[PDB]
Design a protein around this ligand. Structure first.
Ligand code: ZN
Ligand code: ZN
Length: 99
């Protein structure tokens, strides 16, 4: 019913909280913008990394590792694929990185 996706946050080479997960309703497609939103939300609440902080960072991205082992990197500063859709059920893990 609910798809859990473990995620980690790295900022300036450091990581804080452990075993944190995003939750998505099973097999219901979402726009990447929705995942972008959940990601920015946590960056802000857990690391105090606001939208303004993302825009001024050298690099700000999140890497999706899909169930089949492949990966897809999304740029948080400007996500062209913000319109594209994806089945969250295909996502195994998310690695958020900002520097
Ligand atoms: Zn699932
Ligand atoms: Zn695939």
């Amino acid at each position: 019913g609910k798809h859990t996706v473990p995620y980690t946050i790295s900022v300036d080479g450091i990581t804080a909280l452990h075993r944190t997960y995003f939750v998505f309703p099973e097999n219901k497609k979402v726009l990447y913008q929705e995942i972008d939103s959940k990601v920015k939300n946590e960056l802000a609440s857990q690391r105090g990394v606001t939208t303004e902080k993302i825009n001024n960072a050298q690099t700000a991205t999140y890497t999706l590792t899909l169930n089949d082992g492949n990966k897809k990197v999304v740029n948080l500063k400007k996500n062209d694929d913000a319109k594209n859709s994806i089945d969250p059920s295909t996502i195994k893990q998310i690695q958020i990185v900002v520097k």
